[PDB]
Amino acid sequence: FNIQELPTARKEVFKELLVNRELPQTLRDVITITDDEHVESIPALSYIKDKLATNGIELSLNGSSKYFDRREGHIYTEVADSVVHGSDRTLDDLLKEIFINECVSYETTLLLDKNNASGLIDKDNQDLSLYNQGIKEVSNTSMYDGIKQAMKDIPQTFRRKVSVVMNTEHHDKLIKELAQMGLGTLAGDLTKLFNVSHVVVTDDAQDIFVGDFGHAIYAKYEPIMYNKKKQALKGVYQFALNYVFDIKIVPELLRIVKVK
Amino acid sequence: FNIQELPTARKEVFKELLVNRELPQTLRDVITITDDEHVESIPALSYIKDKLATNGIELSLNGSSKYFDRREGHIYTEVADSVVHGSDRTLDDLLKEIFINECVSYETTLLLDKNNASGLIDKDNQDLSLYNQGIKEVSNTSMYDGIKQAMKDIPQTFRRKVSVVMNTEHHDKLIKELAQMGLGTLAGDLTKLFNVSHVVVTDDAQDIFVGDFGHAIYAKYEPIMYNKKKQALKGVYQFALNYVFDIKIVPELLRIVKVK
Amino acid sequence: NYDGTTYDTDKDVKKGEYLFVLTAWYDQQRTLDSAFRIAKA
Amino acid sequence: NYDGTTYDTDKDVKKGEYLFVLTAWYDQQRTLDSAFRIAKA
Three-state helix/strand/coil letters over B202-255? ECCCCCEEEECHHHHCCEEEEEEEEECCECCCCCCECEEEEEEEEECCCHHHEE
What single string gives the DSSP state of each residue in chain B? ----PPPHHHHHHHHHHHS---SSSSGGGTS-----SS--S-TTHHHHHHHHHHSS------SSSSS---EEEE--B--S-HHHHHSSHHHHHHHHHHHHHHHHHHHHHHHH-TT-SSTTS-GGG-S--STTTTPPEEEESSHHHHHHHHHHSS-TTSTTS-EEE-BHHHHHHHHHHHHHHS-TTTTT-HHHHTT-SS---BSS--SEEEE-HHHHS-EEEEEEEEE--B-SSSS-B-BEEEEEEEE---GGGEEEEEE-
B114 to chain A, closest Cα gap in Å: 34
Helix B8-18 / helix B89-112 crossing angle, nearest 10 deg: 50
- Distance, CA of C11 to CA of C34 (rounded, Å): 50
DSSP A42: -
Residues of C in contact with A76 (CB under 8 A): 13-14
Angle at B4 between CA B1 and CA B8, to 5 degrees: 145
A80 to chain D, closest Cα gap in Å: 15
Q: Give the Å distances, CA to CA, from B259 to A172, B82, B139, B145, B192.
A: 20, 53, 6, 10, 22
Does B142 contact chain A (CB < 8 Å)? no
Amino acid at B213: F
Q: Are B75 and B235 spatial neighbours (Cβ–Cβ below 8 Å)?
A: no
CA-wise closest residue to A83 among B70, B37, B47: B37
A with C: touching (≥3 Cβ pairs within 8 Å):
yes
Q: Are A221 and A245 spatial neighbours (Cβ–Cβ below 8 Å)?
A: yes
| From B40, B156, B197, residue closest to A203, measured CB to CB | B156
Q: Are A155 and B157 spatial neighbours (Cβ–Cβ below 8 Å)?
A: no
C19 to chain A, closest Cα gap in Å: 13
Query: Residue D7 is inside which H or E element, if any?
Result: strand D6-11
Breaks (C-N over 2.5 A) in chain D follow: none
- Distance, CA of B177 to CA of B193 (rounded, Å): 13
DSSP A159: T
Interface mutation vs chain B, best among A175, A183, A241, most B CBs within 10 Å? A175
- Distance, CA of A239 to CA of A230 (rounded, Å): 9
Tell me which chain A residue has its CA closest to the CA of residue B50: A77
**Cα atoms in the Cβ-side hemisphere of radius 13 Å centred on A205:** 22
DSSP A43: T
CB pair distance less than 8 Å for C9 and A229 = no
Residue A160: CB atoms within 10 A of its CB come to 11
Query: Residue A180 is inside which H or E element, if any?
Result: helix A168-181
- Distance, CA of B79 to CA of B106 (rounded, Å): 21
Residues of D in contact with A235 (CB under 8 A): 23
C with B: touching (≥3 Cβ pairs within 8 Å):
no
Does B136 contact chain A (CB < 8 Å)? no
Query: Residue A13 is inside which H or E element, if any?
Result: helix A8-18
- Distance, CA of C15 to CA of A60 (rounded, Å): 39
| From A2, A3, A227, residue closest to C13, measured CB to CB | A227
- Distance, CA of A59 to CA of B109 (rounded, Å): 65
Q: Are A121 and A115 spatial neighbours (Cβ–Cβ below 8 Å)?
A: yes
Does C16 contact chain A (CB < 8 Å)? yes
Residue A170: CB atoms within 10 A of its CB come to 17
Determine how β-strand A71-74 pairs with β-strand A240-247.
antiparallel
Q: Are A177 and A212 spatial neighbours (Cβ–Cβ below 8 Å)?
A: no
Residues of A in contact with C13 (CB under 8 A): 76, 227, 229, 238, 240
Backbone angles phi, psi at A149, to 5 degrees: -60, -30
Residues of A in contact with D8 (CB under 8 A): 230, 232
Query: Residue D10 is inside which H or E element, if any?
Result: strand D6-11
Alpha-carbon torsion (B57, B61, B67, B72), positive or negative = negative
Q: Dihedral, CA atoms, A133, A138, A144, A149, nearest 10 degrees?
A: -110
Q: Strands, E, within chain A: which ranges? A: 71-74, 137-140, 163-165, 208-211, 219-227, 240-247, 254-259
- Distance, CA of A221 to CA of A34 (rounded, Å): 7
CB pair distance less than 8 Å for D23 and A235 = yes
Determine how β-strand B240-247 pairs with β-strand B71-74.
antiparallel
Residues of B in contact with A171 (CB under 8 A): 195
Helix B168-181 / helix B143-152 crossing angle, nearest 10 deg: 110
Q: Give the Å distances, CA to CA, from B219 to B69, B93, B105, B125, C14.
A: 11, 26, 15, 14, 33
Does A234 contact chain D (CB < 8 Å)? no
Q: What share of chain D is helix, strand, coil (3-state, %, to 5)?
A: 0, 35, 65
Helix (H, G, I), strand (E, B) or coil at A10: helix
Does A230 contact chain D (CB < 8 Å)? yes
Backbone angles phi, psi at A225, to 5 degrees: -145, 150
Residues of A in contact with C14 (CB under 8 A): 76, 238, 240
Tell me which chain B residue has its CA closest to the CA of residue A98: B47
Q: Are B131 and B137 spatial neighbours (Cβ–Cβ below 8 Å)?
A: no
Backbone angles phi, psi at A50, to 5 degrees: -65, -40
Backbone angles phi, psi at B14, to 5 degrees: -85, -20
- To one decimal place, what's the resolution in Å? 4.0
Q: Are A27 and A200 spatial neighbours (Cβ–Cβ below 8 Å)?
A: yes
Tell me which chain D residue has its CA closest to the CA of residue C10: D13
Residues of A in contact with B195 (CB under 8 A): 25, 168, 171, 201, 203
DSSP D32: -
Amino acid at A208: I
Q: How far apart are the first and last CA of chain B?
A: 65
Helix A143-152 / helix A168-181 crossing angle, nearest 10 deg: 110
Query: Residue A259 contacts by C-beta under 8 Å, 6 or more apart in sequence?
Result: A139, A140, A141, A142, A143, A146, A208
Residues of A in contact with D11 (CB under 8 A): none
Q: Are A71 and A244 spatial neighbours (Cβ–Cβ below 8 Å)?
A: yes
How many cross-chain Cβ pairs, C to D, lie less than 8 Å apart? 9
Q: Are A105 and A23 spatial neighbours (Cβ–Cβ below 8 Å)?
A: no
Query: Residue A190 is inside which H or E element, if any?
Result: helix A190-193
CB pair distance less than 8 Å for D14 and C8 = no
- Distance, CA of B152 to CA of A219 (rounded, Å): 31
- Distance, CA of B28 to CA of B72 (rounded, Å): 20
Helix (H, G, I), strand (E, B) or coil at A34: coil
CA-wise closest residue to B253 among B199, B217, B202: B217
CB pair distance less than 8 Å for C13 and A242 = no
Q: Are B220 and B33 spatial neighbours (Cβ–Cβ below 8 Å)?
A: yes
Strand order in the sheet with B254-259: B137-140, B254-259, B208-211, B163-165
Residues of A in contact with B34 (CB under 8 A): 90
Q: Are C4 and C18 spatial neighbours (Cβ–Cβ below 8 Å)?
A: no
Residues recorded for chain A: 260
Amino acid at B95: L
Helix (H, G, I), strand (E, B) or coil at A14: helix
CB pair distance less than 8 Å for A76 and C9 = no
Q: Give the Å distances, CA to CA, from A177 to A141, A143, A145, A187, B109.
A: 11, 9, 11, 10, 43
CB pair distance less than 8 Å for B43 and A84 = yes
CB pair distance less than 8 Å for D10 and A235 = no
Residues of C in contact with D13 (CB under 8 A): 8, 10, 19, 21
Does A47 contact chain C (CB < 8 Å)? no
**Determined by which method?**
cryo-EM
Helix (H, G, I), strand (E, B) or coil at A256: strand
Q: Give the Å distances, CA to CA, from A48 to A41, A210, A211, B248.
A: 13, 18, 14, 56
Query: Residue A99 is inside which H or E element, if any?
Result: helix A89-112
Does A232 contact chain D (CB < 8 Å)? yes
Backbone angles phi, psi at B255, to 5 degrees: -145, 135
Residues of C in contact with D17 (CB under 8 A): none
- Distance, CA of B38 to CA of A86 (rounded, Å): 7
- Distance, CA of B164 to CA of B199 (rounded, Å): 5
CA-wise closest residue to B43 among A124, A82, C26: A82
CB pair distance less than 8 Å for C23 and D14 = no
Interface mutation vs chain A, best among B185, B190, B191, B212, most A CBs within 10 Å? B185
